[PDB]
Amino acid sequence: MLCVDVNVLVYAHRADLREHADYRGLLERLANDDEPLGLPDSVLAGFIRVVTNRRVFTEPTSPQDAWQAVDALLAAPAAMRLRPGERHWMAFRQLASDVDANGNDIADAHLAAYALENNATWLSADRGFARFRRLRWRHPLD
Amino acid sequence: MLCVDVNVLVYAHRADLREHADYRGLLERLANDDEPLGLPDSVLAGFIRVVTNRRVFTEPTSPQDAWQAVDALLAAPAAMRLRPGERHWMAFRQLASDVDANGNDIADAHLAAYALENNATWLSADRGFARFRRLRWRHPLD
């Protein structure tokens, strides 16, 4: 199973961004592939918060547009929504303990826990994920 | 059941902050009360992220200290950690739809969903929570 971060969804959706052509192709391929594409609820929620956000974009995506994009992706044959498992809280604590996580590292550990609990690859633009030795993390364009 | 926001935990633990005596008493009263104190995993994670944050505090609480406080709160008789339930995703969508949520509203809706799913009172310092008519929200000091 491959799990993806907020950045992968944002690049795939926003045409204005330079990274968009690579991300849109990657997302369509992951969504229609045999391997399940794991989508954490926090990732789906994070993508809506970022695209619709006035601080992030001069012209924010409409919430109605953001929700339709989430709905279409969840519709994809590979897509599986992930809700934190009973294992997610222990996995999050183990990841946080591994790096002595502080500030935003805690947010990363919480996102990372979805991949660790599922033994899934975690795809993120952020290379800070390299910090979690236990985590299986790859650059999305790798 | 009463659910509490990150600010309520943060005020309770930071002696330096002005709100601390009031928040510390309320939190201790909630933790030892018969009505369950519902603590979402996202709220517990958020409290560690804020207390240990270098931008937020000139001297951040240590992660070791932050986790021991979380472990202590969990040990309290009222306290129940909450994981999102089967209805959490639909409840989050309903709250976001109710206010046309955009940007940070999405984060508030996701947190508010733990209270709506559990039919719990949401205690938050933020008065913006009044915008969710479906939510039962009260200021914590009230």
Partner: peptide
């Protein structure tokens, strides 16, 4: 499944999508 692309006008100044910590600071 096909992405339906949307958006125009780019990012606000100083915002980098690549870093979760920076994006979090920019949003609040």
């Amino acid at each position: 499944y096909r992405v339906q692309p949307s958006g125009k006008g780019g990012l606000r100044p100083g915002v980098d999508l690549s870093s979760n910590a920076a994006l979090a600071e920019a949003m609040n």
